[model samples]
Target: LESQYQVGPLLGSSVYSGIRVSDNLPVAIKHVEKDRISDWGELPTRVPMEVVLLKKVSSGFSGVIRLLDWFERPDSFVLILERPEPVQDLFDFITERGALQEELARSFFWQVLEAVRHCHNCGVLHRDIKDENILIDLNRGELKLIDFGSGALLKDTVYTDFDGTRVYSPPEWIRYHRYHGRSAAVWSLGILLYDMVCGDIPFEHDEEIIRGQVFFRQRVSSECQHLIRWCLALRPSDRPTFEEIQNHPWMQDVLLPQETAEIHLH
Candidate 1:
């Protein structure tokens, strides 16, 4: 196999997704416009940071969508990514079911957390951690975190620009217009959890996010609510790190072990 991806119909808004000509494997081909491409990796030319980070995480930490291959186009970069068949976006899944069952949220939420942690553990940051970026395998309820276009190399410095969804963004990012990696990531995690169980994210307006109080309308347990609150703290430092989150009382109710291998829903 030399290098020819049989690009199919547009799967996502920005990516042309299709099957592999070589083996019929589903692949999401992302194209970054010429001007939009800025970040650089170790390559001689400036390659989209997506390619760099995906390869960085490609070393494997589970829950991440594997990058099959990539190539440079004249005006755009093409990223060929593995597409998990029989799985739908978590956004659609949540919309169809309204709010998720507590146990169901636990399974998906736990896996998603692992996915984020996996990226972080690899020293790469998935700045766009949201329901839309997550996929749920219908048959097994397994989760796969996708899309690295909004990703970046993980660092502790304050990032002035954000690459992901605005609503699911961290309170610190909303207020100060600047954010760090772990703290901002935790806030997004909180929003993702609230979206999973409460049928929506906790905040919509600028003040609402800056205030950072998750006024719950649904019937999620207090412990889960507490975990959400802790993650959505107005002060970024108040938010728990991934380790603390894994150790939270709420996650103790999760069926999967904190440091286990691949997971499945029962």
Candidate 2:
């Protein structure tokens, strides 16, 4: 990869990326030290779990960032990642725009769900599904799910360790210290949806999470509120599965208040 691009400008602690020499294409180059990586998921040739996970989700999936090239250096493993220009994380997008109106939020939400669904379909679990991990392209009006550092192979069994963000953590994790991938992901989805349209997350602490009280900061619509409440249910079994949520009333845009009122009047 060095033959194609000498790592430019510090992208922070590890990655030093800016552009490529082959075609002046923008890219994010991440160099991970071997000792720092733990989950080297039994590959033929060992690599970081993120690399393995990225490769899994890359086939026919657009929601994820592309892993263009990787190299095994003496101590550090290099990953040349595709970086779309004029993009910002969903967290920063929310920060700049404040609470997004429902229409825009709906559009954003669908894309995210598709991305996450694609990951699961590809047998990958994106344990961390926070706003910061989703990159929004203002130029193209599209989004990509980023960062697989907290990712793992998909499983139905209970996972004990928590590698993701706390605010996005599920109630099951807080209460039992263990959670399945689907439920935990649904819980994070609930938090993400709430935070995206409300400008902030519902609970900031474990006490609040255990209590399971989500008071909205903004005037979220009835169906939207309904879906969120369902996702945030204390019992993982109570939450909707991805298929259920995908076919939910809110996602289907069923019966607006305006239409409901007209029907009532008629």
Candidate 3:
């Protein structure tokens, strides 16, 4: 296999050291601490599960970042990721401006939904879906979803401590058991959609404030109201399943092929 050319500093965060490699092809080296991750230590067990989930979902969506190769070093796990050209995070994009144009917002929301729907189909839940995790690849004219560290397999499970961004996290999760599983994912997605169209998070900084009113919904654009509704529901069961989301009236409006100019929104 081709070796990566080393680049950037190794960041020692909670999980591992993140190193950038300047190889023949640009790649990122994510070293997950084996000793720290006390699950099945096999790279195939943990890393490849994420890689397969990303790759399979990428087949149906143009916006997700792709994983390439991986290996275990003496002390850390190395993940090879395609280095997409730089663009803006959705958060930065929205913060600079008030919101995106209707068409652009529609376009971005469709792509994001398609990716998330694909993950849901494979029983993979991206628990940490937020603006920072969504990246724009202008060179490829695509969006890329990164960071699977906090994401979970979408099988049945109960979460004790919350695992998502506080502001983007759903009210149901904070308030009761009804929001425990997929509901939070949908709620976060709604907030993300709200941000995409409105250009900022529903709540600015206060977690307590945002968590207090998960059910206080707002009407979004005429085209995306249903989607926004499904995304922000207080109960996980109330939220549309991924398959249901794909068939939503709003999703059709966004993803149904039209002239590129007509379809291309934010």
Candidate 4:
């Protein structure tokens, strides 16, 4: 099966880009070692949660990377996924621009929120929500949420096990050692917004996160500051739901069609 496609450079660990030999279609191949899955404490007979969740999200939403197909080897599993052309991950995009203007950032962020809202409505918790997991189409200004290896089915219970990137983890998780999925996700979005405008993370260590302390190095609009404060509220309940977040003044400004909005990227 691997021979059917010409593989190219690595996209990330265990992930590579390739083209179908027959159609010349672009695809991403993720190679997961069975040994590693088993060592992660899952039964060898169980399907990987990443595969299940990806299928779930892809089935209903274009905001996620589509799972094209898959094959299982003797010691590993391979997943073929749609690769959007002229795309870059959010991390590199931010690094290149240093920081995005509020207008451009709003455009990209609305797409991300739509993706996240779709996932949540699907009953899936994307335990890892960070810039590195987000992909942007340079031409269209669209976004796709990816990297669901840390995802899980949402439940009413508290999540004590942390499988996501530590920097975006909520203060509640750091202090109480347990957290709800929604609040944790909001915290990550807060961090993402800060990074988009500030070109830096607000909290370097657990101390800052725990204290919910932030010092904005650059001047930001009042609405943007309100978003960061509300999303990063010290108490999880104080954080807004997706509905409330969408109603924020900053978000409301973006709701107007881009061409008519007062804000412009270029």
Q: Rate the local accuracy (lDDT) of all candidates.
A: 0.81, 0.84, 0.61, 0.82
lDDT of 1 by residue, 153-190 (tens): 89988899886888888777877789998899998899
Error of 2 at 72 (Å): 2.0
Per-candidate TM equals 0.90, 0.91, 0.73, 0.91
lDDT of 3 by residue, 1-266 (tens): 22344555542352222334443565555666766553232233544345445555545355566667667666766666665545566677678756776666766766777677667776667778888888766444466677675666676667765555877777665566334556677778788877777666666555643443433344455647657766666556787765676677666555342332344422
Q: What residue pairs are clashing in model 4?
A: none
Candidate 2 Cα misplacement greater than 4 A, ranges: 253-266
Worst 10 residues of 3 by lDDT: 10-19
Residue-wise C-alpha lDDT for candidate 4, range 1-266, written one tens digit per residue: 96898999998899899998889899999999877762132333556777777777788566888888877889888999889787889898788878778877787778788999888888888988888999876555567898888888877789988778888999988988899999899999999989988887789889988989778888889889889999999999999988788888898666333342234322
- In candidate 1, which residue pairs clash? none
All candidates: CA RMSD in angstroms? Answer: 3.2, 6.0, 4.8, 3.0
Candidate 2 local lDDT, 1-266, one digit each (tens): 55788567885568776688989799988888889886886467778889899888877566788888888899988888888777678888889889887767777787888899999998999989988888876566667898898889999999998879988898889888999999999999999999978999999999998888889889999999999999999999999999889898788763332343243212
Q: Give the runs in model 1 whose Cα sits over 4 Å from its true position.
A: 1-3, 256-266
Q: Lowest summed lDDT over 10 consecutive residues: which window, candidate 4?
A: 257-266
